[PDB]
Structure 1
Amino acid sequence: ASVYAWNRKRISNCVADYSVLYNSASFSTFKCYGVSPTKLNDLCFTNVYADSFVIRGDEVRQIAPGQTGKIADYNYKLPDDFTGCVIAWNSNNLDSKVGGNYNYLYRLFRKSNLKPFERDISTEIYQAGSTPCNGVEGFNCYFPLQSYGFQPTNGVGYQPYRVVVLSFELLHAPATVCGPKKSTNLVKNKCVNFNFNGLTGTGVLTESNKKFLPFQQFGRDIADTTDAVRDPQTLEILDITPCSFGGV
């Protein structure tokens, strides 16, 4: 998508793994604000709306929480205390045709400053003098749709860094897309601590002899001590016994 039409796409209820993105051998000036880039995959947060653009890479450092300029004035603005990540990396081989890739024209003029996270779309030309333009372009019309010069012989500051906006907001909203959570193997017949799917604790973990309905995840008994669990990757039912203790 372009800067006039970067959509607020609601990709939800799936997983977008980020650990394959760090080993892409491509990322240049990636900076995840608020939270660290390392723990993006284990802990997640709601409002997982996504955006994309190839911004011209001369002023990537103008995009920051509380930093204005040209890109932060007329393209896309970040508010103070940003939770989320914008990842900038080059796109030299594919977003560069011969003779200039003029498939992404961009807004050069707006009357006011852009609101943070505002997708701006308009047709009308800039108002800078007092005389209105008659449709025919004159000396004070100032046609906002300028062309990025995207040629293969441009340098690294002139070539577009591709940016994706995985914006993170807080609402009364479902946390729909999170990263992957790794799992180890299963230990049996051992006084051991466990980290199952939601529930952790200590005990001796055995094979079962009971059965469940297809909707329970674990089970308790009289006076509510947890003595059962279901494992999620094996489709089996697993029992809990307390560890060996007593007096001497």
Structure 2
Amino acid sequence: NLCPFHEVFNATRFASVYAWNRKRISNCVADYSVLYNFAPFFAFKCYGVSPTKLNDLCFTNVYADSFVIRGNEVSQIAPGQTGNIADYNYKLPDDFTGCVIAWNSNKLDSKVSGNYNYLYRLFRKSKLKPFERDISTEIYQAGNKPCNGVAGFNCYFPLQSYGFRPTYGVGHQPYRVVVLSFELLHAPATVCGKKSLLNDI
């Protein structure tokens, strides 16, 4: 059984970073080489694991988190980072054990008039916990008066759009990100690459 990595990386549309999507991977053989072999991954930084010796160990579960951000925000998809993405949209823990994968998708997620399909959270009362998701559409109260559910003075809609256009600079062009989390709980292994679990035969 091959792990459905094609469904995650080759998706027609990705999720907004504020509502980042997670696909749990379990009970399959993971051809990690197929990853690095198919798209030109502009960023491929692994934390706590080794990309050269990937498909040699096992894991209880593997989580694939995918979303879209601009180019200059890919640096926020890393442990101990700050910014609108790391604080309000997608936060990685300090002891992150996994890989962060990102590639430019200007040909897919940009249009001449502006692709307002992808959003991000601009305001929030507090920072996000690691792997926390906030999809609420509550009007952010910046002042000391209630907003009554509509935007106004010191009352802003919390989500903002990118409006990707193909003529933007590389720092403002869309980038599709895939975050691979590797979990190892007190359970037998379920996701292994080419490891010595051929013994199942």
Is 1:93 the counterpart of 2:107? The answer is: yes
Is 1:39 the counterpart of 2:53? The answer is: yes
RMSD: 2.1
Q: Aligned-pair distance for 1:93?
A: 1.0
Partner of 1:179: 193
Instruction: Report which structure shows greater RCO (CA 8 Å, sep ≥6).
Output: 2
Q: Which amino acid aligns with 2:29?
A: V
Is 1:28 the counterpart of 2:42? The answer is: yes
User: Unaligned regions of 5+ residues in structure 1, if any?
Assistant: 182-194, 199-216, 218-231, 233-248
CA distance 1:77–1:140, shift in 2 (3 Å): same
Partner of 1:15: 29
Give me the identity figure in percent.
88
CA distance 1:196–1:170, shift in 2 (3 Å): closer
Q: Figure out how many residues of one structure are paired with residues of the other and give that number.
A: 187
Partner of 2:180: 166
Q: Aligned-pair distance for 1:46?
A: 2.1
CA distance 1:3–1:113, shift in 2 (3 Å): same
* Contact 2:138–2:149 (8 Å) recurs in 1: no
Range 82-91 or range 169-178, more displaced: 169-178
CA distance 1:166–1:135, shift in 2 (3 Å): same
* Contact 1:7–1:119 (8 Å) recurs in 2: no
TM-score by length of 1: 0.69
Is 1:115 the counterpart of 2:129? The answer is: yes
Range 20-29 or range 106-115, more displaced: 20-29
Cα displacement string for residues 1-52 of structure 1 (whole angstroms, at most 9, x for unaligned residues): 2224323332321233121222335111210101111111222322212211
Q: Aligned-pair distance for 1:152?
A: 0.7
Instruction: Give the structure with the larger helix fraction.
Output: 2
User: Equivalents in 2 of 1:98, 1:122: separation in Å?
Assistant: 30
CA distance 1:120–1:173, shift in 2 (3 Å): farther
Q: Aligned-pair distance for 1:157?
A: 1.4
1:189-204 superposed matches below 5 A: 197-198=198-199
CA distance 1:175–1:92, shift in 2 (3 Å): farther
CA distance 1:138–1:30, shift in 2 (3 Å): same
CA distance 1:43–1:115, shift in 2 (3 Å): same
CA distance 1:196–1:19, shift in 2 (3 Å): closer
Given the alignment, which residue of 148, 157, 161 partners 1:143?
157
Rg comparison, structure with higher value:
1
* Contact 1:48–1:175 (8 Å) recurs in 2: no
| Structure 1 segments of 4+ aligned residues over 6 angstroms from their partners | none
User: Equivalents in 2 of 1:3, 1:67: separation in Å?
Assistant: 16
